[PDB]
């Protein structure tokens with residue numbers, strides 16, 4: 001099976017192609033952050049919208065949400081969202097899904113296929129929001145480092161986030177708890 | 192709350208201090224790999240040992256299993272396992288747990304405390320094994336890159352892994368599925 005190799009190979013997939021970064025980011029670091037953000041958003045959403053989400057499936061979906069970029073590489077959204085490329089890249093992403101996991105036990109094989117082809121719309125939407133939050137946070141850290149080239153990136157991500165908070169109250173709550181002073185200049189928790 | 196800041200601050204915590212690495216590894220990359228390994232080990236263990244594990248708690252424990260290293264930094268095991276430092280570092284790790292998460296909702300606060308102070312012994316043991324597997328895998332990748340300085344590291348980690356496979360059949364199965372040709376020289380799945 002290639003599955004363990006793929007998990008480590010995600011470190012070789014860079015994000016933010018074409019932008020100067022003070023800190024280079026790979027898909028594994030991004031996915032770690034998306035898992036944690038997805039968990040936090042889930043807890044907030046459960047309490048506000050009065051429900052219980054299946055966190056096993058949510059966390060596993062977040063964990064593997066970008067695993068196909070080991071084949072496609074990471075195509076930045078200004079490129080992937082172009083009308084010329086939008087549908088073909090989703091079709092390509094779908095082709096990678098249907099091919100990735102071959103030499104496994106049916107316990108793993110079925111469970112891996114279930115995760116990749118997940119049709120739980122709410123879990124997909126939570127991870128999509130977590131994905132946007134993480135992109136915003138990265139842009140905040142770069143700006144904080146002094147990277148003027150991410151100012152316009154932070155602004156458009158922040159504008160899209162603001163609009164999402166008007167429609168998803170759990171995102172507004174997340175914004176209020178964490179995204180108003182981010183990152184922290186004083187990491188008091190270290191001392 | 193410092194929780195979101197801490198999630199990103201784990202990128203500033205390096206592993207393998209005092210060893211030459213061709214690729215520098217941080218706690219976020221390591222934790223991503225441990226989450227995925229913990230999931231795979233859990234599926235194998237469930238099938239072999241005839242049970243169902245609560246994967247929500249397992250994955251969340253793996254996710255945060257090294258979060259206290261944002262305060263302690265990452266102390267390598269030859270140092271932390273010295274008889275002089277063994278108990279004090281665990282006491283220190285415990286002090287960090289009881290202090291980390293302050294300004295949260297009780298939904299988050301209680302859930303975060305539950306995860307950190309988890310007393311499910313089996314979940315702790317799965318993550319401990321995943322942690323050893325990840326260390327072995329890192330050592331395999333470095334050796335594969337040509338890093339002769341990790342040969343003796345790979346050997347001792349491999350020896351400890353071999354002994355663990357004699358006592359935990361799900362680890363032997365994992366070894367048979369993934370750890371016999373690792374990493375792959377031919378990443379055929381990319382093409």
Ligand SMILES: Nc1ncnc2c1ncn2[C@@H]1O[C@H](COP(=O)(O)OP(=O)(O)O)[C@H]1CO
Pocket residue numbers: 015016017019074075076077078080081131132135152153156
């Ligand atoms: N303004 C931007 N300029 C350049 N790259 C960007 C920008 N915004 C995002 N990226 C990169 O595309 C990746 C994912 O972005 P996203 O998740 O926020 O957008 P969607 O794919 O969800 O539409 C992100 C890092 O490479």
Ligand SMILES: Nc1ncnc2c1ncn2[C@@H]1O[C@H](COP(=O)(O)OP(=O)(O)O)[C@H]1CO
Pocket residue numbers: 206207208210265266267268269271272322323326343344347
């Ligand atoms: N032989 C070694 N030489 C130097 N550093 C090591 C070695 N083995 C492990 N490390 C580093 O200690 C970290 C964790 O190791 P571990 O998880 O396998 O050992 P335990 O803490 O579980 O006893 C690891 C990377 O920094």
Ligand SMILES: [Mg+2]
Pocket residue numbers: 128131132
């Ligand atoms: Mg996105």
Ligand SMILES: [Mg+2]
Pocket residue numbers: 030034065066131
């Ligand atoms: Mg993503």
Ligand SMILES: [Mg+2]
Pocket residue numbers: 319322323
């Ligand atoms: Mg360990």
Ligand SMILES: [Mg+2]
Pocket residue numbers: 221225256257322
């Ligand atoms: Mg660890």
